[PDB]
Input
Amino acid sequence: GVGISTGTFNNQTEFKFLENGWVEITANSSRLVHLNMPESENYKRVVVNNMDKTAVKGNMALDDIHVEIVTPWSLVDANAWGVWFNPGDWQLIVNTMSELHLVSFEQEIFNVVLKTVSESATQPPTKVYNNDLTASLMVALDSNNTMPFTPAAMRSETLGFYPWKPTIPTPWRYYFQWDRTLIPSHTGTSGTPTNVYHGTDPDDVQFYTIENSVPVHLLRTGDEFATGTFFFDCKPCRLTHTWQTNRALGLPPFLNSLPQSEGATNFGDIGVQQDKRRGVTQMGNTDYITEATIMRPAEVGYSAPYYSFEASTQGPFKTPIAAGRGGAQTDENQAADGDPRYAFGRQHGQKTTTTGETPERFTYIAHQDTGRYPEGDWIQNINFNLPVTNDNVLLPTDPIGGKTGINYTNIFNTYGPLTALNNVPPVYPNGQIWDKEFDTDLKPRLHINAPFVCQNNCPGQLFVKVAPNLTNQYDPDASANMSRIVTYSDFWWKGKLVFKAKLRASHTWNPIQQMSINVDNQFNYVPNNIGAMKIVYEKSQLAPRKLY
Amino acid sequence: GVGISTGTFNNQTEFKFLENGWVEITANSSRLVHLNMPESENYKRVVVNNMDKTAVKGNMALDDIHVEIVTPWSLVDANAWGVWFNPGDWQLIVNTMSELHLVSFEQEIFNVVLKTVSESATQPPTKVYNNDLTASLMVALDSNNTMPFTPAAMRSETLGFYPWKPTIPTPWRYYFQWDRTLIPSHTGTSGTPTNVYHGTDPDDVQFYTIENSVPVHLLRTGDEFATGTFFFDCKPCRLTHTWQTNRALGLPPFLNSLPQSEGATNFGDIGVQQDKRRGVTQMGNTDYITEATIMRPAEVGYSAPYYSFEASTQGPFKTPIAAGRGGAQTDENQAADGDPRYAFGRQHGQKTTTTGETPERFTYIAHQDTGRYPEGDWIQNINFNLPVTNDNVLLPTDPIGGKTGINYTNIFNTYGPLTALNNVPPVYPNGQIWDKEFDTDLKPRLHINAPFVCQNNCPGQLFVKVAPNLTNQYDPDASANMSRIVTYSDFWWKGKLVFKAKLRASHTWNPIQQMSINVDNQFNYVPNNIGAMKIVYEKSQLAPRKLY
Amino acid sequence: KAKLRASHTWNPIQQMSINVDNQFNYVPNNIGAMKIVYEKSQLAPRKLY
Ligand SMILES: [Ca+2]
Ligand SMILES: [Ca+2]
Ligand SMILES: [Ca+2]
Ligand SMILES: [Ca+2]
Output
């Protein structure tokens, strides 16, 4: 079966308009994947330890020590928006749809090829490449998710984003249990804190092998491998944002006095003394009904401690947060808090011809308003008694623990039974699409890395590896290290991801926000005179939705 | 499937005589196509700017600045008469048929081969060619015409014209939007006119990719690709010309006096004073019924401004005209006006052994008489009053704008509701066969480049490309430029174009014009002692037809 | 009766949108004053040939 193709290249997105404003989006994606034989045909338990860094007082957050099992397999990950949609498809979906549903997923591997490299080491000297017609490509599909879930989008290692650029898979590796202790300190700390890696707890040791837990297929040139169709189990993802705050929920106060002339300084007037008003409040001990005092249904968003690192049995880790935000976009300098930052390279959006090893990055700033402005928070004594007196207020300016740069807001947490919150928004093109749910008895209410989380069923990971091409001399009983003919493989990948979307409706008199090409961004969507390209990030929930 | 052919070579033309003088012409054409891997596997946006030329006052017409998207694909175009008929087939069709109908079109790609070049760089040094049995040829057929319509005949880049000479496809590229301004000037102009390229309008930007909009097939040696049959939507094309002018329409004047002796100076005589005649005229204010004054049904042909360049958002362009012409063929020096000029090379008609880079060319001079002789035009004051006086005539000799070399005829336009006109005639072998209609709400009454214009349905373009053959070293994340094994491909193409013709009838006592080989042209249809060949152009509508 | 559009190119296209600049042409003022600003219909290229 050498001279016969086993598949088709398809990278088209189809919209199929059903009934009742629901369309079916079929995203096809094909790619040529390049794969070299493993640097080692063995599994390894490698420890990483950068104590030299953290040894410097004040650097706890630069902790990198961990342990991982390095396997001789590669992972073919296509779980990122950029792998399926191009800028033009995203604009259509994001501008005209109101919500998204993830439906199916299926892959395929065809037109496999295995070449060999011979050192034509003559003068120059040289190199020769030849087909190894009887060689094999090993393929394993972990349908039962026996293996550790390792989504590549987290480290910018998924398949590439351009239909016409060959891509590659990533070396697979997973974490191995270890104990580590790191006591925090600051520049003025004395003596040496405590920074040790304790080793492994035998009761938490799990060494996984693909050979032992997954059936492997050997594909020769004439072979093809096709995953069946996987049908997802999820909630819909919204493509519209909310802008309401507790301050904009409900019936506003009745203005007994309205302006009578156009004018920036012509305001309306409630026209009633603040302690002589009517309405409901939750401050049982005052007569002041204010817009900051009046009672609202519940609470949109919450407060959490910031740049808080917690520690458990294997080192410090940052305390997660859902969303960030602020008022008049002090943007960028605005950033920080809980706005995701993505760093990527030449294959996932960075300008293709860019030299150097510095990645490209961006901080995604969502349209939703469900965050907090710490500088505006404050706490005061129940007696109320305005104007508040210094000993009766704790402002986000007063120090804590004596530290000049720490407030109570840094320690603060206002999550409770009244917290209303939104799931995470899609991030094009670098964001991950779906995630696997934690196998704990009590699960997170949402995942900070993907808008879709398969509870029960999640697609299995696909592993690939070039089978060993040994030379006439091979001795299993020797330390050496098997020597094998330099072999590599190229195969085509093809996936199909199906969504179900709901067409949007116009509910207000005014137009709304839409994604569009303009004089300014115009050149982020076309190649240059050298064929250089780049894929700029874009927002998903542009279009307000009322919350209450 | 390596050692098995997937097709047949056929280059025969069949005439199948149906019923009622209608024959069916089946033209088969096969060719061996040679294709190298792309100079770049990327799409590029390249700008061409030759301001150095146009910077020279008086050279506006030598404007070449434009912008184009250079793709890594090649186009297999067979839309030219020479690709389907040889001189002998053309003579038969042109001499015995009266009209042509375009019916079907279908193509096929078989016996694909992919070789590799190894630098046997030893001493000489050397080169080695080897089959890459598992390599692929990428094929894409744009059935829905998603891509820009780029007919190769316009730049003499279609498949070759000899069944026994290997051919090649042309690198595909299409136009990209841009703004350009060029103010006209002449040799004596002062200062510098204004010649700038403004860039791109974001609202007109369209970057097309074949990968994203067309399904691609990968063919290995054992594979074949076959387009289904396309059935055209068109009007018939005529193979007879008209010779009548307004001056030869209707009942000629009754001669009251006829010659009585053979003799060049023995003329007939209307024998009635010009202002005492009967008939109809459209000059409500005179009694002169002349052959130049008498009323005719409508008007055959029209007048348009000549060597008129107009300008829009992207530079100057020549104002199109339908047909040219003149009386006693002042031929060649006659040319100019609106007679097409074709420049081509070794593969499309130029003498095969000819050295140098100068192309071969010809100006097609049609048999139809629907043009104008400006030198004979003139305008005069309504009062008439003959003999006309200088201040009452504007002759094509009197200057305009003060310019010594410009008449009113240069500015003149007489197109109107009474204009009778003919469609363009076929041009063998360099002319294009069919064209796609403009997607504007109001279409042209005809196209100046092809006798057949599919309104609704037009065949889709066929693109070809050698899939990337990577080496053991490929890094998607690097600026470099992928390095790949030098690969190339050879495949056979086979097309079938079906027409439907109407056999001609003899309507007059005298014989008519027929194409024939003679002592003079005899050697344009046979090879020489070295195997040199050439394909001389020929006319299609030789045989008069009465218009009225 | 309208026909929904399709995306035929890699790049996004021109769309009508509210922005910081035009924002107040679509809402009344403190006196109830209103206005209806003109807008364009054929924003989105189509290939002619
Ligand atoms: Ca233990
Ligand atoms: Ca906001
Ligand atoms: Ca514009
Ligand atoms: Ca004539």
Q: What stands out?
A: The domain at 1-548 of chain B is CATH 2.170.30.10 (Empty Capsid Viral Protein 2).
